Amino acid sequence: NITTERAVLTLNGLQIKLHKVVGESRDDIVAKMKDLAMDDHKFPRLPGPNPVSIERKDFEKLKQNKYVVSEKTDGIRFMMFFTRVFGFKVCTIIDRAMTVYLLPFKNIPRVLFQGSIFDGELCVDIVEKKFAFVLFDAVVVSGVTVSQMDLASRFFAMKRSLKEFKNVPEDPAILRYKEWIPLEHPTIIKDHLKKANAIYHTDGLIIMSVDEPVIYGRNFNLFKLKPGTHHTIDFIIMSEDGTIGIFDPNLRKNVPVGKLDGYYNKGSIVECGFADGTWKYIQGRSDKNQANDRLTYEKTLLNIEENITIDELLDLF
Ligand SMILES: Nc1nc2c(ncn2[C@@H]2O[C@H](COP(=O)(O)OP(=O)(O)OP(=O)(O)O)[C@@H](O)[C@H]2O)c(=O)[nH]1
């Protein structure tokens, strides 16, 4: 049987109960996805790109090359994988740490189960108070590797397969497709962004190449933009006098970086924002035992400093 263990995900004040796939079953689903995705990376990862923050150096490239734009949905990143395990046709969603849950739909066409890997976000529909799964892109559809073709071909393949699918009320998520708008369409972009934000929780926008094949991992040509300067960092309290530190993952030692005004419990993790030269407390995190690493900190400072805004960005066009 597929050895499962139950789990509940909470997003935006709502929860979803799912069977987390465990042990050798988890191991086999992951190894199956690695083969279908033909990823020979020596480390377990999803066959999908992680965006990079937009930098002012990128503005040239944005204006030479072709790109599409969409809202950055705020929810959980999942690769959705249709396969067959021990004879049964299975729909799974895998997250970035390689944790596998079943997410079953009634009406998935049996072709998908020959090997579909679609990329998306599990998220909540504000208007409907139901979960939605929003598909960003496809890697393999019914056994056909679509990853090296251009974005419009990938969506053509994906939409083709699901063309006869209908959701039914008992399905655990509303399957929906990311509408990507061309980066030369500012008024169409703004309007799409306004409609998008009526339905979803968004964290800015994502800008993606119209024609490059799928990258797996950090994709230096997939850009995200946070609205305004609302970057935060999680620091560890290294002193009761609020000395905040940041983790160096290869020393495995926290390094002192600043100091907060107030009394703080050593070893806690505080989410802070930067304002006028110092970091300021926003909330303590009881759910974390580790600060953000140096890399995340260095890059967030650069972004704070550069202060790119969505209106600056959409006015380049
Ligand atoms: N690749 C991609 N990611 C998207 C898209 N829409 C929303 N996202 C989400 O944006 C994430 C970007 O990574 P980060 O900028 O680190 O954001 P995060 O994973 O929410 O982490 P925090 O910033 O710590 O909250 C992706 O991993 C997706 O979960 C999209 O169209 N493509």
Short mmCIF file of C-alpha atoms and ligand atoms in Angstrom, two decimals:
data_model
loop_
_atom_site.label_atom_id
_atom_site.label_comp_id
_atom_site.label_asym_id
_atom_site.label_seq_id
_atom_site.Cartn_x
_atom_site.Cartn_y
_atom_site.Cartn_z
CA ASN A 1 0.00 0.00 0.00
CA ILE A 2 1.28 3.60 -0.01
CA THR A 3 2.37 4.17 3.59
CA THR A 4 0.88 7.43 4.62
CA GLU A 5 0.73 9.55 7.71
CA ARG A 6 -1.78 12.41 8.15
CA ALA A 7 -0.96 16.12 8.18
CA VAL A 8 -2.75 19.41 8.13
CA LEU A 9 -1.59 22.52 6.37
CA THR A 10 -2.78 25.92 7.52
CA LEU A 11 -2.79 28.75 5.03
CA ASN A 12 -4.44 32.05 5.40
CA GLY A 13 -6.57 31.00 8.37
CA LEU A 14 -7.78 27.82 6.67
CA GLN A 15 -6.47 24.29 6.90
CA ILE A 16 -6.16 21.30 4.55
CA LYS A 17 -5.83 17.77 5.75
CA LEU A 18 -3.64 15.57 3.56
CA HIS A 19 -1.90 12.21 3.75
CA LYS A 20 1.82 12.78 3.96
CA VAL A 21 3.48 9.92 2.09
CA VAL A 22 6.11 8.28 4.23
CA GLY A 23 9.18 6.06 4.16
CA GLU A 24 10.00 3.99 1.10
CA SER A 25 6.77 5.16 -0.60
CA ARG A 26 8.10 8.79 -0.29
CA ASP A 27 11.48 7.65 -1.54
CA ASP A 28 10.01 5.96 -4.56
CA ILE A 29 7.77 8.87 -5.61
CA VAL A 30 10.75 11.19 -5.38
CA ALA A 31 13.03 8.84 -7.32
CA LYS A 32 10.35 8.48 -9.97
CA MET A 33 10.09 12.29 -10.32
CA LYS A 34 13.88 12.60 -10.56
CA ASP A 35 13.98 10.14 -13.51
CA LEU A 36 10.98 11.61 -15.42
CA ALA A 37 12.54 14.99 -14.91
CA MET A 38 15.95 13.64 -15.98
CA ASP A 39 17.59 15.62 -13.25
CA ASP A 40 21.04 14.24 -12.55
CA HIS A 41 21.77 16.74 -9.83
CA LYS A 42 23.45 14.98 -6.91
CA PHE A 43 21.00 16.52 -4.38
CA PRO A 44 17.19 16.11 -4.03
CA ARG A 45 15.27 19.10 -5.44
CA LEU A 46 12.04 19.94 -7.28
CA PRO A 47 12.33 20.21 -11.13
CA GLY A 48 11.52 23.90 -11.03
CA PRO A 49 13.12 27.38 -10.76
CA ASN A 50 13.63 29.51 -7.72
CA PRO A 51 13.41 33.24 -8.58
CA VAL A 52 16.03 35.80 -7.94
CA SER A 53 15.30 39.39 -6.72
CA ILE A 54 15.31 41.97 -9.52
CA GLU A 55 18.31 44.26 -9.39
CA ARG A 56 18.84 47.58 -11.19
CA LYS A 57 21.48 45.83 -13.32
CA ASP A 58 18.70 43.70 -14.81
CA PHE A 59 16.78 46.56 -16.31
CA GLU A 60 18.68 46.39 -19.64
CA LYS A 61 18.02 42.67 -20.09
CA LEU A 62 14.32 43.22 -19.23
CA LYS A 63 14.13 45.61 -22.14
CA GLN A 64 16.08 43.51 -24.69
CA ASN A 65 14.59 40.07 -24.14
CA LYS A 66 11.00 38.77 -24.06
CA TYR A 67 9.33 38.16 -20.73
CA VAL A 68 5.93 37.65 -19.21
CA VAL A 69 4.69 38.89 -15.82
CA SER A 70 2.34 37.64 -13.13
CA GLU A 71 1.48 38.16 -9.44
CA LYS A 72 3.69 36.29 -6.92
CA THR A 73 0.97 34.13 -5.26
CA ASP A 74 1.54 33.79 -1.49
CA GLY A 75 0.94 30.19 -0.45
CA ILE A 76 3.12 27.04 -0.65
CA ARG A 77 5.29 25.99 -3.62
CA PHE A 78 4.52 22.48 -4.79
CA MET A 79 5.54 20.45 -7.80
CA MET A 80 2.49 18.37 -8.77
CA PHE A 81 3.33 14.92 -10.09
CA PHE A 82 0.93 12.39 -11.63
CA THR A 83 2.35 8.86 -11.72
CA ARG A 84 1.42 5.25 -10.91
CA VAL A 85 2.66 3.56 -7.78
CA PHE A 86 2.23 -0.09 -7.08
CA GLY A 87 -0.29 -0.20 -9.91
CA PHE A 88 -2.34 2.79 -8.59
CA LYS A 89 -2.70 6.02 -10.42
CA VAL A 90 -1.48 8.74 -8.04
CA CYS A 91 -1.59 12.57 -7.89
CA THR A 92 1.11 13.97 -5.56
CA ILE A 93 2.29 17.45 -4.57
CA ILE A 94 5.95 17.71 -3.44
CA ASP A 95 7.42 20.68 -1.63
CA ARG A 96 10.89 22.26 -1.66
CA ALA A 97 12.23 20.18 1.18
CA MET A 98 11.09 17.07 -0.85
CA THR A 99 8.09 16.14 1.35
CA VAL A 100 5.34 14.29 -0.45
CA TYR A 101 1.56 14.48 0.12
CA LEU A 102 -1.28 12.80 -1.89
CA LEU A 103 -3.76 15.27 -3.36
CA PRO A 104 -6.46 13.23 -5.11
CA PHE A 105 -8.95 14.49 -7.65
CA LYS A 106 -11.93 12.55 -9.00
CA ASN A 107 -11.65 13.27 -12.66
CA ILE A 108 -7.95 13.32 -13.68
CA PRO A 109 -7.58 11.81 -17.24
CA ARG A 110 -5.56 8.55 -17.21
CA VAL A 111 -2.97 9.93 -19.65
CA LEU A 112 -1.67 12.30 -16.97
CA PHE A 113 -0.67 9.25 -14.96
CA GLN A 114 1.86 8.20 -17.56
CA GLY A 115 4.01 10.99 -16.07
CA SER A 116 2.97 14.61 -15.66
CA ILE A 117 5.17 17.10 -13.66
CA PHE A 118 3.38 20.52 -13.43
CA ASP A 119 4.73 23.43 -11.33
CA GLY A 120 2.56 25.46 -8.96
CA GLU A 121 1.40 27.03 -5.74
CA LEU A 122 -1.15 25.64 -3.26
CA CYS A 123 -2.96 28.69 -2.02
CA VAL A 124 -6.32 30.03 -0.72
CA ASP A 125 -9.04 31.77 -2.75
CA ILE A 126 -9.98 34.91 -0.76
CA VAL A 127 -13.34 35.18 -2.44
CA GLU A 128 -14.35 31.54 -2.09
CA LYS A 129 -12.58 30.55 1.11
CA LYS A 130 -11.53 27.38 -0.69
CA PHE A 131 -8.02 26.21 -1.54
CA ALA A 132 -6.77 26.67 -5.07
CA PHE A 133 -3.81 25.06 -6.83
CA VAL A 134 -2.39 27.46 -9.40
CA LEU A 135 -0.27 25.98 -12.18
CA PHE A 136 2.70 28.10 -13.28
CA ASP A 137 4.38 25.90 -15.88
CA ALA A 138 4.87 22.22 -17.03
CA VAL A 139 7.96 20.05 -17.29
CA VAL A 140 6.66 16.65 -18.54
CA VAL A 141 3.01 16.06 -19.68
CA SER A 142 1.78 12.44 -20.19
CA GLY A 143 5.30 11.11 -20.66
CA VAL A 144 6.29 13.83 -23.16
CA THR A 145 9.21 15.96 -21.91
CA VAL A 146 8.04 19.51 -22.59
CA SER A 147 10.83 21.26 -20.61
CA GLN A 148 13.12 22.41 -23.49
CA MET A 149 10.37 23.96 -25.56
CA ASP A 150 9.29 27.57 -25.01
CA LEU A 151 6.66 28.70 -22.45
CA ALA A 152 3.67 28.81 -24.79
CA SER A 153 4.40 25.24 -25.95
CA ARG A 154 4.56 24.02 -22.30
CA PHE A 155 1.19 25.60 -21.54
CA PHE A 156 -0.23 24.25 -24.79
CA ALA A 157 0.80 20.69 -23.72
CA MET A 158 -0.46 21.17 -20.14
CA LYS A 159 -3.81 22.73 -21.08
CA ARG A 160 -4.36 20.04 -23.72
CA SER A 161 -4.19 17.20 -21.21
CA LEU A 162 -6.48 18.82 -18.69
CA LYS A 163 -8.92 20.10 -21.31
CA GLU A 164 -11.44 17.41 -20.37
CA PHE A 165 -10.91 17.69 -16.60
CA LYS A 166 -13.59 19.13 -14.40
CA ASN A 167 -13.31 19.95 -10.77
CA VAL A 168 -15.98 18.67 -8.48
CA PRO A 169 -16.95 20.19 -5.04
CA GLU A 170 -15.30 17.38 -3.07
CA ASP A 171 -11.92 17.96 -4.88
CA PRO A 172 -9.34 19.20 -2.34
CA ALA A 173 -8.20 22.20 -4.46
CA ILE A 174 -9.46 24.23 -7.33
CA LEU A 175 -6.96 23.59 -10.20
CA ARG A 176 -6.31 26.94 -11.91
CA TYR A 177 -3.72 28.23 -14.47
CA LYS A 178 -1.29 31.20 -13.96
CA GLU A 179 -2.23 33.90 -16.48
CA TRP A 180 1.09 35.31 -17.74
CA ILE A 181 0.89 38.81 -19.32
CA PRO A 182 3.68 40.21 -21.65
CA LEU A 183 6.08 42.59 -20.03
CA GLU A 184 5.35 45.17 -22.74
CA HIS A 185 1.70 45.40 -21.71
CA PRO A 186 1.80 47.79 -18.55
CA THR A 187 -1.89 48.76 -18.55
CA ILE A 188 -2.87 45.10 -19.15
CA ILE A 189 -0.43 44.06 -16.45
CA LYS A 190 -1.86 46.54 -13.91
CA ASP A 191 -5.36 45.49 -14.62
CA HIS A 192 -4.48 41.78 -14.34
CA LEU A 193 -2.65 42.51 -11.07
CA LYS A 194 -5.79 44.33 -9.72
CA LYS A 195 -8.04 41.36 -10.63
CA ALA A 196 -5.49 38.86 -9.28
CA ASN A 197 -5.31 40.59 -5.98
CA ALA A 198 -9.11 40.32 -5.55
CA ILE A 199 -8.79 36.53 -5.39
CA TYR A 200 -5.35 35.70 -4.00
CA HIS A 201 -2.79 36.77 -1.47
CA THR A 202 0.13 38.04 -3.52
CA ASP A 203 3.67 39.05 -2.61
CA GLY A 204 4.51 41.32 -5.58
CA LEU A 205 5.13 39.98 -9.10
CA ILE A 206 7.15 37.34 -10.98
CA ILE A 207 8.78 38.14 -14.33
CA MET A 208 9.63 35.06 -16.49
CA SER A 209 11.33 34.48 -19.90
CA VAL A 210 8.95 33.62 -22.64
CA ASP A 211 11.36 31.31 -24.40
CA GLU A 212 14.05 29.77 -22.26
CA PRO A 213 13.52 26.06 -21.29
CA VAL A 214 12.76 25.09 -17.67
CA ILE A 215 15.55 25.69 -15.15
CA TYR A 216 15.63 23.48 -12.04
CA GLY A 217 16.97 25.41 -9.05
CA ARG A 218 18.01 29.06 -8.76
CA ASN A 219 17.15 30.75 -11.95
CA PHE A 220 19.04 33.95 -12.30
CA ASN A 221 16.68 35.03 -15.10
CA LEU A 222 13.41 34.52 -13.12
CA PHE A 223 12.88 37.73 -11.16
CA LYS A 224 10.66 38.46 -8.26
CA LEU A 225 9.67 41.90 -7.03
CA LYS A 226 8.32 42.65 -3.54
CA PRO A 227 5.99 45.72 -3.34
CA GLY A 228 7.88 48.49 -1.58
CA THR A 229 10.58 47.89 0.90
CA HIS A 230 8.81 45.27 2.97
CA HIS A 231 11.64 42.78 3.26
CA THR A 232 12.01 41.25 6.74
CA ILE A 233 14.84 39.10 8.28
CA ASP A 234 14.78 36.42 11.02
CA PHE A 235 17.54 36.90 13.45
CA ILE A 236 18.57 34.87 16.44
CA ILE A 237 18.86 36.59 19.79
CA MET A 238 22.39 36.12 20.93
CA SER A 239 22.11 38.19 24.16
CA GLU A 240 19.34 39.23 26.45
CA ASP A 241 20.35 42.81 25.47
CA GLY A 242 18.92 42.10 21.97
CA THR A 243 22.16 41.34 20.03
CA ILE A 244 20.78 39.84 16.84
CA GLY A 245 22.86 37.39 14.82
CA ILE A 246 22.52 35.67 11.40
CA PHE A 247 23.46 32.06 10.63
CA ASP A 248 26.60 31.09 8.72
CA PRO A 249 25.61 27.62 7.39
CA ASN A 250 29.17 26.54 6.80
CA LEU A 251 30.64 27.67 10.04
CA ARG A 252 27.30 26.51 11.61
CA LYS A 253 27.83 29.52 13.89
CA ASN A 254 25.61 32.56 14.24
CA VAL A 255 27.48 35.83 13.65
CA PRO A 256 26.58 39.14 15.51
CA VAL A 257 25.23 41.69 13.09
CA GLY A 258 23.31 44.37 15.03
CA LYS A 259 21.45 45.03 18.34
CA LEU A 260 17.83 45.69 19.15
CA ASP A 261 16.32 48.10 21.68
CA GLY A 262 14.44 46.08 24.24
CA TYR A 263 14.70 43.00 26.43
CA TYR A 264 14.87 39.73 24.58
CA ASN A 265 15.14 36.08 25.28
CA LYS A 266 18.50 34.68 24.15
CA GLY A 267 18.10 32.02 21.48
CA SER A 268 14.73 33.18 20.18
CA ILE A 269 14.18 34.11 16.57
CA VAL A 270 12.75 37.57 15.89
CA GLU A 271 11.36 38.81 12.60
CA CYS A 272 12.67 42.29 12.03
CA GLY A 273 12.40 44.96 9.30
CA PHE A 274 15.04 47.62 8.52
CA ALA A 275 14.16 51.23 9.16
CA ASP A 276 16.48 54.13 9.19
CA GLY A 277 19.80 52.35 9.75
CA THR A 278 18.65 49.72 12.29
CA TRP A 279 16.61 46.59 12.29
CA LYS A 280 13.29 46.89 14.14
CA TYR A 281 11.28 44.12 15.93
CA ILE A 282 8.05 43.01 14.20
CA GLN A 283 7.29 39.63 15.76
CA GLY A 284 8.98 36.87 17.64
CA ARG A 285 8.74 33.53 15.85
CA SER A 286 8.00 30.61 18.26
CA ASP A 287 7.90 28.26 15.26
CA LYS A 288 11.57 28.69 14.21
CA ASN A 289 14.81 27.76 15.95
CA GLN A 290 17.22 29.18 13.39
CA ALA A 291 17.98 32.56 11.81
CA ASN A 292 18.20 33.34 8.18
CA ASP A 293 21.61 32.72 6.65
CA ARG A 294 24.17 35.34 5.54
CA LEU A 295 23.36 35.07 1.88
CA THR A 296 19.72 35.90 2.53
CA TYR A 297 20.74 38.79 4.72
CA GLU A 298 23.32 40.21 2.23
CA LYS A 299 20.85 40.06 -0.61
CA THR A 300 17.98 41.61 1.40
CA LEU A 301 20.15 44.57 2.35
CA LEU A 302 20.95 45.19 -1.29
CA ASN A 303 17.29 45.08 -2.09
CA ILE A 304 16.47 47.46 0.77
CA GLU A 305 19.10 49.84 -0.50
CA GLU A 306 18.13 49.63 -4.19
CA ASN A 307 14.43 50.28 -3.50
CA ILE A 308 12.97 49.15 -6.72
CA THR A 309 9.17 49.57 -6.64
CA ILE A 310 6.39 48.01 -8.81
CA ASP A 311 5.55 51.43 -10.25
CA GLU A 312 9.18 52.14 -11.10
CA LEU A 313 9.30 48.70 -12.78
CA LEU A 314 5.98 49.01 -14.70
CA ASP A 315 6.98 52.50 -15.97
CA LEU A 316 10.01 51.08 -17.85
CA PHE A 317 7.33 49.96 -20.37
N1 LIG B 1 8.78 30.13 -9.61
C1 LIG B 1 7.65 30.79 -9.27
N2 LIG B 1 7.36 31.00 -7.98
C2 LIG B 1 6.19 31.67 -7.77
C3 LIG B 1 5.31 32.11 -8.71
N3 LIG B 1 4.20 32.72 -8.11
C4 LIG B 1 4.49 32.63 -6.84
N4 LIG B 1 5.66 32.00 -6.55
C5 LIG B 1 6.26 31.69 -5.26
O1 LIG B 1 7.33 32.62 -5.01
C6 LIG B 1 8.37 31.89 -4.40
C7 LIG B 1 9.62 32.70 -4.48
O2 LIG B 1 10.58 32.39 -3.50
P1 LIG B 1 10.90 33.42 -2.28
O3 LIG B 1 11.01 34.77 -2.88
O4 LIG B 1 11.97 32.89 -1.47
O5 LIG B 1 9.50 33.40 -1.42
P2 LIG B 1 8.92 32.35 -0.31
O6 LIG B 1 9.30 30.96 -0.72
O7 LIG B 1 7.49 32.67 -0.08
O8 LIG B 1 9.76 32.70 1.08
P3 LIG B 1 9.75 34.03 2.09
O9 LIG B 1 10.19 35.16 1.22
O10 LIG B 1 10.70 33.67 3.14
O11 LIG B 1 8.35 34.15 2.55
C8 LIG B 1 8.37 30.60 -5.15
O12 LIG B 1 9.14 29.56 -4.54
C9 LIG B 1 6.91 30.30 -5.26
O13 LIG B 1 6.46 29.61 -4.14
C10 LIG B 1 5.58 31.87 -10.07
O14 LIG B 1 4.89 32.18 -11.04
N5 LIG B 1 6.79 31.18 -10.27
#
